[PDB]
């Protein structure tokens, strides 16, 4: 799949995006990669942020829906009017579909101020497509028309400009060191994963796991933090704090509320603790771990503190992305790890994924 090698590019904290076109003649955009939502959405109008957008009025094979779609979401809102097109991706498989299209017409807080991206483009299900479960997201035309396998691939690379690769339909096994681990998909809405253990630094933080999925778990490209849940961030601050309390840092830090700032070449990343997820596994009682450092939770701006707390649960955003290549395997219903061969560490510790754990009751980690 080497054509489709390091077809992802972004700025340090405003998301990564691949080429696309849409219509025809073909229209050249650039477009977020979210796997925690499921429309694909295209600027339609001159924004002034916008280097370019969707005119549809040029393009022979455009469809009009005749009917509107309104999106508000936690940061920010877009609205749109519904078309399908025929879209394809350069560097990714030699097809073209039509697909479902959402002509952004009026926004807030969506588009940012000197980023190079015109839209976005929604991996994950149906369930929580807008208006409604029947508007057919990207991914599912793409599989349903041509013969791309149902699965995607994702390595993440970071740094400020950001690189990655996008994998569409498949697995490239240079992009990752060791074997993959695979977690289920529990529900096919967002890619909800079950949490089963938290780890700092070898320590378990002994909640109740319930509170590690309260009320999801999910793995989101489109999210920069790890996003945790008030109880369980306020246990997992708590361990960090103790972790790193050779150095005293205000309460507002940890927030991410202001910044912490080192002299240049001397930060002290060893007083930082690892953090480990244990995930569940694809076997009764079997799971498995995955290990980040503070190269991934401490983000240069100075740095800030990228574990927050959250009302909708855990998100497993770029700081864990950046670590892995992550195998969206849809087919099979399930999530595949690996140590990613562009992750970024030091030479004492290096991000892992390990198995097999033995952990029971993991069903009783997810919430109802
Ligand atoms: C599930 C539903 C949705 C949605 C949704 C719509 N538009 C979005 C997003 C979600 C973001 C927010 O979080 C995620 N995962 N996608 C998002 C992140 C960004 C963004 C900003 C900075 C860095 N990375 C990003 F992805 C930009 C733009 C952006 O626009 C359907 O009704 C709720």
């Given at each position: 799949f080497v054509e489709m090698v390091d077809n992802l590019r972004g700025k340090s904290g405003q998301g990564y995006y691949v080429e696309m076109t849409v219509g025809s003649p073909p229209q050249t955009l650039n477009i977020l990669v979210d796997t925690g939502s499921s429309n694909f959405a295209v600027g339609?109008?001159?924004?002034?942020?916008?280097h370019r957008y969707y005119q549809?009025?040029?393009?022979?094979?455009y469809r009009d829906l005749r009917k509107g779609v309104y999106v508000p979401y936690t940061q920010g809102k877009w609205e749109g009017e519904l078309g399908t097109d025929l879209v394809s991706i350069p560097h990714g498989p030699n097809v073209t579909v039509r697909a479902n299209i959402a002509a952004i017409t009026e926004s807030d807080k969506f588009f940012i101020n000197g980023s190079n991206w015109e839209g976005i483009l929604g991996?994950?299900?149906?369930?929580?497509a807008r208006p409604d479960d029947?508007?057919?997201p990207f991914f599912d035309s793409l599989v349903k028309q041509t013969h791309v396998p149902n699965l995607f691939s994702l390595q993440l690379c970071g740094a400020a400009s950001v690189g990655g690769s996008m994998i569409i339909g498949g697995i490239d096994?240079?992009?990752?060191?060791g074997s993959l681990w695979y977690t289920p998909?529990?529900?096919?809405?967002?890619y909800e994963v079950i949490i089963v253990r938290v780890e700092i630094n070898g320590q378990?933080?002994?909640?109740?796991?319930k509170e590690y999925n309260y009320d999801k778990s999910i793995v989101d490209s489109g999210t920069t933090n790890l996003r945790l849940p008030k109880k369980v961030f306020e246990a997992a601050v708590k361990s960090i704090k103790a972790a790193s309390s050779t150095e005293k840092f205000p309460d507002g830090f940890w927030l991410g509320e202001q910044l912490v700032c080192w002299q240049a070449?001397?930060?002290?990343?060893?007083?930082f603790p690892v953090i480990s997820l244990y995930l569940m596994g694809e076997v009764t009682n079997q799971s498995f771990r995955i290990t980040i450092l503070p190269q991934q939770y401490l983000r240069?701006?100075?740095?800030?503190?990228?574990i927050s707390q959250s009302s909708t649960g855990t998100v497993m955003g770029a700081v864990i992305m950046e670590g892995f290549y992550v195998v969206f395997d849809r087919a099979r219903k399930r999530i595949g790890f690996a140590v990613s061969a562009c992750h970024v560490h030091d030479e004492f510790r290096t991000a892992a994924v390990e198995g097999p754990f033995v952990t029971l009751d993991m069903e009783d980690c997810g919430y109802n």
């Open positions: 339609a109008a001159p924004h002034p942020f916008l549809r009025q040029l393009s022979s094979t991996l994950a299900y149906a369930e929580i029947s508007l057919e096994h240079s992009l990752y060191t998909i529990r529900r096919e809405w967002y378990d933080l002994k909640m109740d796991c070449g001397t930060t002290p990343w060893n007083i240069p701006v100075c740095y800030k503190f990228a």
